[PDB]
Ligand binder design. Structure first.
Ligand SMILES: Nc1nc2c(ncn2[C@@H]2O[C@H](COP(=O)(O)OP(=O)(O)CP(=O)(O)O)[C@@H](O)[C@H]2O)c(=O)[nH]1
Ligand SMILES: [Mg+2]
Lengths: 192, 81
């Protein structure tokens, strides 16, 4: 069973767990309770080939710096979640997330996600953004971003409408199969 | 510092301790997961051990200090170090 480790992270306030749950439950029940556990896998269909998916979402807690997602390091591919209707989220994703990955240069593939699509294609909401002098991101805008950061693939989706959630995971899996592999192991010391 | 609302400080340590509890209990859970047989990679089990140890110290200091809060709460004559 093709088991791939995918970790969902985003500079946004929330949307990390909702993204994963929406695809596994087809509907996010909500819950504001923080995240501590990790064990959470889901089956996905890619090209008719059953694939084991590892869902690991990090909570918005700084104290968990040490208790950080153990999967993160091994993560075959991490998803970049940001708000499309807000250019700022897009402005900072490449700003902070890119300099970090390049520092190690793991050559690990990286997928792009456009969570919250329901409000991205909303006229009235878009009108509201104008009030704050903000405009939503288009497809070619992100497409170009994938070229500069060398992202394996970039797509947009919603957890409420489920635009293309399955597509995110489906493409993310391929990110390791087709593009360059992953496999990253490095110990800190013999004893702890 | 704190006047008569010394009870606030005490509860604060209870909260901090409890937060660390989730941290400690969290790592241990991950340890038990990889502890059985050999799944995925051993590196995951190691990270759980180190992060868990770190949390152990966290609870140790927070726990002892909490006891110090209640101690100094009863006594009103003895001065602080
Ligand atoms: N319509 C819509 N709402 C979304 C989408 N993604 C997230 N949300 C909303 O934002 C919430 C974010 O939930 P979640 O991701 O679990 O929060 P979190 O950031 O994991 C909580 P913490 O950071 O404390 O662990 C959802 O419950 C939902 O209300 C999306 O694609 N579409
Ligand atoms: Mg969460």
């Amino acid at each position: 069973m093709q088991a791939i480790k995918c970790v969902v992270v985003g500079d946004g306030a929330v949307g990390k767990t909702c993204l994963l749950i929406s695809y596994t439950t087809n509907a996010f029940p909500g819950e504001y309770i923080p995240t501590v556990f990790d064990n959470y896998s889901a089956n996905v269909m890619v090209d008719g080939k059953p694939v084991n998916l590892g869902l690991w979402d990090t909570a918005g807690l700084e104290d968990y710096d040490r208790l950080r997602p153990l999967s993160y390091p091994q993560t075959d591919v991490f998803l970049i979640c940001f708000s499309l209707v807000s250019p700022a989220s897009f402005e900072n994703v490449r700003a902070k997330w890119y300099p970090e990955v390049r520092h190690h240069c793991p050559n690990t593939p990286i997928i792009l996600v456009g969570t919250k699509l329901d409000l991205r294609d909303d006229k009235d909401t878009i009108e509201k953004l104008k009030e704050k002098k903000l405009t939503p991101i288009t497809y070619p805008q992100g497409l170009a971003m994938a070229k500069e950061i060398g992202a394996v693939k970039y797509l947009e989706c919603s957890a409420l409408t489920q635009r293309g959630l399955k597509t995110v995971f489906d493409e993310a899996i391929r990110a390791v199969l087709c593009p360059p592999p992953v496999k990253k192991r490095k110990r800190k010391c013999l004893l702890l | 510092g704190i006047p008569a609302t010394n009870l606030s400080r005490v509860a604060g340590l209870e909260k901090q301790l409890a937060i660390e509890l989730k941290v400690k209990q969290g790592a241990e859970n991950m340890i038990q997961t990889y502890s059985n047989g050999s799944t995925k990679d051993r590196k995951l089990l190691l990270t759980a051990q180190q992060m868990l140890q770190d949390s152990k110290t966290k609870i140790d200091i927070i726990r002892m200090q909490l006891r110090r809060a209640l101690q100094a709460d009863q006594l009103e004559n003895q001065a602080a170090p």
